[PDB]
Amino acid sequence: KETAAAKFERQHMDSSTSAASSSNYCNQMMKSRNLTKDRCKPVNTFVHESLADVQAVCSQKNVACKNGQTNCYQSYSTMSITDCRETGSSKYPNCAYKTTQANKHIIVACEGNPYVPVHFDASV
Amino acid sequence: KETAAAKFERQHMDSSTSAASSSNYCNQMMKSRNLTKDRCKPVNTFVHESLADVQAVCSQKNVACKNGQTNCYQSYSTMSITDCRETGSSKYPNCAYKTTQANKHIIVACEGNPYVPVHFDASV
Ligand SMILES: [Cl-]
Ligand SMILES: [Cl-]
Ligand SMILES: [Cl-]
Ligand SMILES: [Cl-]
């Protein structure tokens, strides 16, 4: 099984580009990160900052998570992100996603030693 | 019991102001909308647009909700929003919230006739 930190990296990190460069970014990245293997993952956010900047959020502002847990943290700065969400044309195995690029603060849940991101809760 | 549309209005609409004007906006609004009555609601977003503009999102872009349902819609334009999330100092009945104002697209789930917003899914 994948560790929770490595699953967060695979699902949410895309440091190789500054921003989504096209409307087909999400169809390509949801496929390549293996988020459409047996079903289309409905919603997923990628963060276009270094892994170190995203890990650093775990020592920034502590805030509640949506589920009421207390180990979420909100980045002090906005980050470049792309949100991917399935469109009404999406039908597995032919998944199809809308790509929305934005600059937002991110909220992550952190756990472990090292204390690192294990879930993406939201952007603001 | 409150209808689902009226609960969405009470929890997520604040058309009376263009934006949060202070850091204490969320402590005041979470109290006044009765979101701290028996426990502190951990996370809640208010939208600073008219009710008609938010209802209109239900005929805009259809997108998956985070839970995989297919009745979510993303606003075509960004809207003024304030996200309220409890801080580490929050301890019911002394709830305390961080106020983050932003201009983001909103995602809502819609239901009914009239087909109107019944849940706030996320901002992008
Ligand atoms: Cl994989
Ligand atoms: Cl996500
Ligand atoms: Cl009430
Ligand atoms: Cl909310």
Side-chain angles (χ1 to χ4, degrees):
Chain A
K1 312 193 30 249
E2 196 175 28
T3 64
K7 178 171 177 176
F8 176 93
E9 290 160 353
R10 178 175 57 88
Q11 293 195 143
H12 299 302
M13 293 297 312
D14 178 17
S15 309
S16 72
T17 193
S18 64
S21 60
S22 118
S23 52
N24 292 313
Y25 174 91
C26 289
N27 284 347
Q28 292 162 192
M29 284 296 294
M30 295 300 289
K31 188 181 165 99
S32 58
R33 295 297 185 87
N34 297 143
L35 307 179
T36 58
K37 299 276 259 213
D38 273 343
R39 52 193 193 267
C40 310
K41 187 177 190 258
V43 171
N44 190 66
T45 297
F46 291 104
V47 186
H48 300 298
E49 299 301 342
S50 65
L51 178 62
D53 279 2
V54 173
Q55 289 168 334
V57 175
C58 296
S59 56
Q60 291 172 22
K61 189 65 176 198
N62 183 209
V63 303
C65 313
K66 280 188 177 176
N67 80 352
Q69 288 191 284
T70 64
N71 59 322
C72 277
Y73 289 82
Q74 183 165 321
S75 70
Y76 297 145
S77 68
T78 64
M79 292 187 172
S80 172
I81 66 180
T82 306
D83 198 31
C84 301
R85 290 201 169 221
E86 286 188 273
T87 63
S89 297
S90 192
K91 140 252 206 287
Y92 172 80
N94 306 122
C95 299
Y97 288 90
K98 180 182 163 46
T99 296
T100 305
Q101 174 64 40
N103 293 90
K104 298 340 181 179
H105 305 265
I106 66 170
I107 304 175
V108 299
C110 300
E111 175 184 288
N113 171 194
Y115 190 63
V116 297
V118 294
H119 295 119
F120 191 93
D121 202 53
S123 77
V124 299
Chain B
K1 312 193 30 249
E2 196 175 28
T3 64
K7 178 171 177 176
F8 176 93
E9 290 160 353
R10 178 175 57 88
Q11 293 195 143
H12 299 302
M13 293 297 312
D14 178 17
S15 309
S16 72
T17 193
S18 64
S21 60
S22 118
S23 52
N24 292 313
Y25 174 91
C26 289
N27 284 347
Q28 292 162 192
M29 284 296 294
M30 295 300 289
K31 188 181 165 99
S32 58
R33 295 297 185 87
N34 297 143
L35 307 179
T36 58
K37 299 276 259 213
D38 273 343
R39 52 193 193 267
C40 310
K41 187 177 190 258
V43 171
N44 190 66
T45 297
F46 291 104
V47 186
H48 300 298
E49 299 301 342
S50 65
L51 178 62
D53 279 2
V54 173
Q55 289 168 334
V57 175
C58 296
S59 56
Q60 291 172 22
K61 189 65 176 198
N62 183 209
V63 303
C65 313
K66 280 188 177 176
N67 80 352
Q69 287 191 284
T70 64
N71 59 322
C72 277
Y73 289 82
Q74 183 165 321
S75 70
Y76 297 145
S77 68
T78 64
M79 292 187 172
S80 172
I81 66 180
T82 306
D83 198 31
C84 301
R85 290 201 169 221
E86 286 188 273
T87 63
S89 297
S90 192
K91 140 252 206 287
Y92 172 80
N94 306 122
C95 299
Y97 288 90
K98 180 182 163 46
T99 296
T100 305
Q101 174 64 40
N103 293 90
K104 298 340 181 179
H105 305 265
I106 66 170
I107 304 175
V108 299
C110 300
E111 175 184 288
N113 171 194
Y115 190 63
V116 297
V118 294
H119 295 119
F120 191 93
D121 202 53
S123 77
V124 299

